[PDB]
Design a protein around this ligand. Structure first.
Ligand SMILES: *[C@@H]1O[C@H](CO)[C@@H](O)[C@H](O)[C@H]1NC(C)=O
Ligand SMILES: [Ca+2]
Lengths: 48, 96
């Protein structure tokens, strides 16, 4: 009953932002930001 | 691009052509790189020494040379044939 829904909404908004900033690279390539987002998605997964 | 102009415009060279074959260079830029490397090899004479390397998270040689070669017609032909045979795959690593 606490405003637990607002923080979850902000978390999903942050997850959507992280999905938007991901850069798809051809032929199994990557950059630093993409590698940094593969670790941040663990933070969302454990919260969910 | 004439041999006399090129020999009179600079001193001999020890050239190394480093080619990026990571995943991102897949597509138009790969064929453009192949044509550009062939054209750049066309600017070298018998007094220059060249070798073509290639890196994608790991650095290697494109042909069976493993060191600088005299860059005559035969060696340049071998290097061109090896360059026209590369593919794009992997992650870029400029340090290696
Ligand atoms: C080079 O081209 C030949 C075709 O004559 C092919 O068989 C060979 O696999 C190519 N080399 C590489 C490393 O792909
Ligand atoms: Ca790249």
């Amino acid at each position: 009953w606490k405003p637990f829904e607002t923080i979850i909404l902000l978390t999903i908004f942050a997850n959507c932002v992280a999905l938007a900033v991901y850069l798809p690279m051809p032929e199994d390539d990557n950059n630093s930001l993409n590698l940094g987002l593969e670790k941040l998605e663990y933070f969302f997964l454990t919260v969910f | 691009r004439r041999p006399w102009y090129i020999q009179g415009a600079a001193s001999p060279k020890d050239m190394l052509i480093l080619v990026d074959v990571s995943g991102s260079v897949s597509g138009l830029t790969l064929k453009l790189i192949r044509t550009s490397v062939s054209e750049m090899l066309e600017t070298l004479s018998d007094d220059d020494f060249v070798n073509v390397a290639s890196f994608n998270s790991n650095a290697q040689d494109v042909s069976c040379f493993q060191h600088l070669v005299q860059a005559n017609v035969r060696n340049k032909k071998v290097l061109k044939d090896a360059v026209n045979n590369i593919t794009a795959k992997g992650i870029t690593d400029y340090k290696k």
